[PDB]
Amino acid sequence: DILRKVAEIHGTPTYVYFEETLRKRSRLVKEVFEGVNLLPTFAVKANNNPVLLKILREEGFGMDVVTKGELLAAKLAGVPSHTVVWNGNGKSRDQMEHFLREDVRIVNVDSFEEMEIWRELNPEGVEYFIRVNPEVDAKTHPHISTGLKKHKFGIPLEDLDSFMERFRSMNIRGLHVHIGSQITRVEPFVEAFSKVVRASERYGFEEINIGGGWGINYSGEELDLSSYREKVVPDLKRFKRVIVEIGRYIVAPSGYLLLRVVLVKRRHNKAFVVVDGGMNVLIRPALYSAYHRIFVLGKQGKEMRADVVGPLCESGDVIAYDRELPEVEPGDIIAVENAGAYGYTMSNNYNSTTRPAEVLVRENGRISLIRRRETEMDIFKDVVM
C-alpha cells in the first residue's frame, strides 16, 4: 500500500525514495572495501536533492561534485568541505576561486591546460589527483575501451609521464580513474585498475581515486560483489587513502517513479497506456534506451501487452516498450523501478510541462515531501516581460 499511499497524498508524477534502501546500499558499498582506508563519496550528478545527500553524509560519504550547483547541494546537506572531491573538464578560474573560498581541497585534474590555471593560482592545501585513461582490452569490453580513448575526459595513461615532467613538485597525491557507467562485469575494473595501480607505484603515490560506475540490475544483470571484493580490492590495500565515487548503485534502487494512467488507447494489435509524465519526467528510456521494469500498483497479471507512453507531443516520449501487464484502467498507477539515479536530475519542462514532486519514505514510516511539484507559473518564472 505504501506506494499508493504516497500517490494518494502527493499525486503524480512523483519520485518516491526509501531511506532504508539508500542506507543499506551505501553500507553495502563500504563493506565491499573492508580492509581498505576508504573515503567513499557519492556522485551528486546522479541525484542532487540535499535531503537524500544528508542521509549519505550520515553514512560516512563525502561528495563528488562538478559544478558550483553541486557544491551548493553538498553545503545544503551539511557536508564538511574536506570530504568534497571536485571533478570537471571545464573548471574556470572563477569556479576555482569559489571552490577554494569554500575550503575544497581535493581536485581531480582533467588536463594539462587545467593544471596550468591551478599554477597561476597556486593554492595552498589543495591535493591534486590526475585523471588518467587506461587502455582497456578493445576486443571484450569494446564499449568501455573506445570511450576511454575518445571521450573528452582525463589524459591517456600513457601520457602520465609527460604530465609529471611539467608539474612535478605540485601537491600531486595520486591518480583518478573512472572508466564508465552501468558496468556489471568485474574484469574491466580489474584491467583498468591494475594498470593505474602499477603507474601509481612507479611514482610512489599513497592515494588513489578509482571512480565509480558500478552497474545495477535493470533487466537481469548484476555486478558480482564477491568477485569484485576478491579480484579488485586486494590491489587497493596498500594505499593510505582510496576514494570511490559511487552514484547509480546507491541511489537508483532507492527510487520509484509513480505515474497515473490517463487513458488506455487501443489500436488493433497494440495498446498505448498513456500516463501523466513522459520524457519530461524520466528521459533515460528515450535518450539512453535504458530498460526499467514497471508494475501496476495493486494489480498483477499478464493479459495486456502495451507500450507505456507520456502525454507529450513527441515521437520517442516512451516510458516502457512492449510490456506484459494486467488489464490497465484509467486512474491506475504505474511504478517505474530503479528511478532514483539520473531521473529527476534529467527532468525538464519540454512541452511546457511541470517537473515532478519527490517524496521520502523514512525508516520510521513518515512520508515526507522533499521536492514540491512545479506549478504552471514556475514554467515562466524567469521570463522577463
Ligand X SMILES: Cc1ncc(COP(=O)(O)O)c(C=O)c1O
Residues that bind ligand X (CB under 6 A): 43, 45-46, 64, 87, 178, 181, 211-214, 245-249
**Residue 142 Cβ vs ligand X, minimum distance, rounded to whole Å:** 19
Q: Is 180 flagged in the annotation as binding?
A: no
* 10 vs 105 by CB, closer to ligand X: 105
Report the candidate in 79, 33, 30, 71 with the shortest Cα–Cα distance to residue 53: 79
* 37 vs 184 by CB, closer to ligand X: 184
Q: Is 284 flagged in the annotation as binding?
A: yes
* 146 vs 375 by CB, closer to ligand X: 146
Report the candidate in 206, 198, 214 with the shortest Cα–Cα distance to residue 242: 206
Is 313 catalytic? The answer is yes
**Residue 199 Cβ vs ligand X, minimum distance, rounded to whole Å:** 18
Residue 135: how many CB atoms within 10 A of its CB?
Answer: 14
Q: State the Cα–Cα distance between residues 382 and 108, nearest whole angstrom.
A: 34
**Residue 282 Cβ vs ligand X, minimum distance, rounded to whole Å:** 16
* 38 vs 328 by CB, closer to ligand X: 38
**Residue 26 Cβ vs ligand X, minimum distance, rounded to whole Å:** 12
**Residue 370 Cβ vs ligand X, minimum distance, rounded to whole Å:** 20
Report the candidate in 138, 135, 136, 118 with the shortest Cα–Cα distance to residue 127: 118
SS3 242: strand
Q: Is 222 flagged in the annotation as binding?
A: no
> Of 268, 313, 315, 377, which residue is the catalytic one?
313
SS3 215: coil
Q: Is 314 flagged in the annotation as binding?
A: yes
**In this chain, which residue has its C-beta nearest to ligand X?**
247
**Residue 105 Cβ vs ligand X, minimum distance, rounded to whole Å:** 17
Q: Is 238 flagged in the annotation as binding?
A: no
Name the DSSP letter for residue 53: H
C-alpha cell at 351: 512541452
C-alpha cell at 162: 609527460
Q: State the Cα–Cα distance between residues 322 and 93, nearest whole angstrom.
A: 49
Report the candidate in 30, 78, 29, 31 with the shortest Cα–Cα distance to residue 53: 78
Residue 229: how many CB atoms within 10 A of its CB?
Answer: 16
Q: Is 342 flagged in the annotation as binding?
A: yes
Q: Are 26 and 61 in contact (CB under 8 A)?
A: yes
Report the candidate in 44, 75, 27, 51 with the shortest Cα–Cα distance to residue 367: 51
Half-sphere exposure of 280 (CA within 13 A, CB side): 22
* 213 vs 285 by CB, closer to ligand X: 213
| Partners of 264 in the β-ladder | 273
| Partners of 109 in the β-ladder | 130
Q: Is 245 flagged in the annotation as binding?
A: yes
Q: Which residues contact 139 (CB under 8 A, 6 or more apart)?
A: none
* 151 vs 299 by CB, closer to ligand X: 151
Catalytic residues: 313
Binding residues: 213, 245-248, 284, 288, 314, 342
Binding residues for pyridoxal 5'-phosphate: 213, 245-248, 342
Binding residues for substrate: 248, 284, 288, 314, 342
